[PDB]
Design a protein around this ligand. Structure first.
Ligand SMILES: [Mg+2]
Ligand SMILES: [Mg+2]
Ligand SMILES: [Zn+2]
Ligand SMILES: [Zn+2]
Lengths: 329, 329
């Protein structure tokens, strides 16, 4: 029965947990567990919902065991999205997000890629996979992730939301479903267009009262945290991007063995292809997204300087390879 | 006094001997003898060097009696490496290998693991064995194999190279020594790095004239044939891998009785440990090796599809055991 969640951003930002340079690749298994628990603890959701910390840790374990050992879409990617969501909500959402929606964003971020196998939605649709048949080609993977999120959560020993009442769980369920389904890259352009129209009209007006407009912002922020590669230091940008390229190469190899069409961008398997793909992805997807995001939330415009520094680095790598490839001609 | 060995790959590939599905475990003792003789006969080395077939058969017998009844490193493993070497040379080497080097590759492949006792080089060095003292910790087993190869060969009734002149035997001896010594797994990474640099420069250029570069390729090919497990049908992959695991388990048992350190990968003695070890060995050793090999010799890239099929099979086995082990937690 509160107006907004119990958060003071400046106390939260003073913690050693608050660092935009966080990279799960440099953390051990026990370190990642501590990060997830610390996010829940420092955001006060454990005490606000009387969360059994034995169920929280059991739920965390069950979440990790349902992620697969993929190069990119793995348990460390989930923790990266959880931690980045914690950074984004602390920066801009402290005064309109509710307590239940805050708990929902933490669960959704950690659960958003459950049981990923390093294959894209196009593979499932083209191969007519069992998952594609279940979901009738509609956001196949994201529907699968959200389903397993609740199958794991509603289990008795992992029920971290056991103390929520009917109305609170209904809102938590709606927030998790909408935010995970909006991690589908096929819905990126629609959210970008709506953000542009909102920015044309001056911006968001009283988010604490407009429930549907507040949910849109939460979906926008989780999608932002999902694309964490270009907003991290370049060493983090390069290691994760090289891991995604490995998944792309494995899919093309599987698609050829199954006589399925492949997209030409996924075929590149060297450093020059990596840099060229990152330049295009940043110039046409990430940068226009954060330009609209920084206009609605100017506190986040420092991310544009991180995106530009990484973009300048990838262009230096591409220029070196092109300078070596032009001499053949 | 020839430019290259007298071989036409397409005539050779039409023989019933040419089959990548060959497995020595399914052959009788007399069948294996016939396979070894047929390799020598069909490659024309018997007539090219006027080989006394009574000495060839006596040499074959003496080779077999110097192999021990190990689960993996036995006489059938030697025939597997001989036959796989015959497949590899027929596929890619017909136009640069010389007649003497061809005969040397057949002898080296059959002799490459002589008097193996199912124990690794690390055991000899750690136990300060007599063999480790003889060879000053340098490629202990491989030096031992090559020594016995010539002790068996230079015997009068087994001298299959009696008709070679001085220059031809000197090259044959150099090829056998270098190729057997390069079966030392401790030299795998160095050969992989050189193959990567050669592939960066466009590939091998006129191997028929560069003697040292041609010897490197022969060493690369014999090492390829030594690791025949992942490039065979899965039933062959599993039976031989289970035999190697038995040797690993026997060594750890011997090392504990002698108060010697043991590597943790050798302790696994069940099917789940077998699958986990094969996935790691294929992902980090075999697959990167054949990716470089297929880039220098694209005719061999079908082996990558065999490696992937076996890798997918081992991952299905590991997933079943993990799905049964995660429910305890
Ligand atoms: Mg996803
Ligand atoms: Mg050996
Ligand atoms: Zn994701
Ligand atoms: Zn061997």
């Amino acid at each position: 029965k509160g107006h907004s969640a119990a958060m003071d951003a400046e106390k939260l930002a003073a913690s050693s947990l608050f660092t935009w340079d966080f990279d799960a690749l440099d953390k051990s298994d026990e370190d990642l567990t501590a990060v997830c628990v610390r996010v829940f603890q420092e955001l006060h959701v454990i005490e606000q919902f009387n969360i059994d910390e034995k169920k929280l840790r059991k739920w965390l374990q069950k979440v990790r065991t349902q992620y697969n050992k993929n190069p990119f879409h793995n348990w460390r990617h989930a923790v990266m999205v959880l931690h980045t969501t914690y950074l984004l909500l602390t920066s801009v959402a402290t005064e309109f997000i509710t307590e239940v929606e805050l708990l929902a964003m933490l669960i959704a971020a950690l659960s958003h890629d459950l049981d990923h196998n390093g294959l894209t939605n196009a593979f499932h649709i083209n191969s007519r996979s069992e998952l594609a048949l279940v979901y009738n080609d509609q956001s196949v993977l994201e529907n699968h992730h959200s389903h397993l999120a609740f199958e794991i959560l509603l289990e008795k020993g992992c029920n971290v939301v056991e103390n929520l009442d009917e109305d609170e769980f209904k809102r938590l369920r709606a927030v998790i479903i909408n935010c995970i389904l909006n991690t589908d890259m096929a819905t990126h352009h629609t959210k970008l267009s709506k953000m542009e129209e909102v920015n044309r009209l001056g911006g968001f007006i009283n988010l604490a009262e407009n429930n549907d407009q507040r949910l849109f912002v939460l979906a926008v922020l989780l999608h932002t945290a999902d694309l964490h590669n270009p907003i991290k230091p370049f060493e983090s940008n390069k290691r994760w991007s090289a891991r995604l390229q490995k998944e792309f190469n494995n899919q093309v190899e599987l698609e050829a063995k199954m006589n399925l069409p492949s997209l030409p961008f996924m075929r590149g398997n060297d450093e020059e292809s990596l840099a060229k793909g990152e330049i295009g992805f940043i110039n046409f997807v990430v940068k226009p997204w954060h330009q609209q995001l920084s206009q609605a939330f100017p506190k986040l415009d420092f991310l544009l300087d991180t995106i530009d520094a990484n973009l300048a680095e990838w262009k230096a790598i591409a220029e070196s390879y092109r300078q070596m490839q032009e001499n053949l001609y």
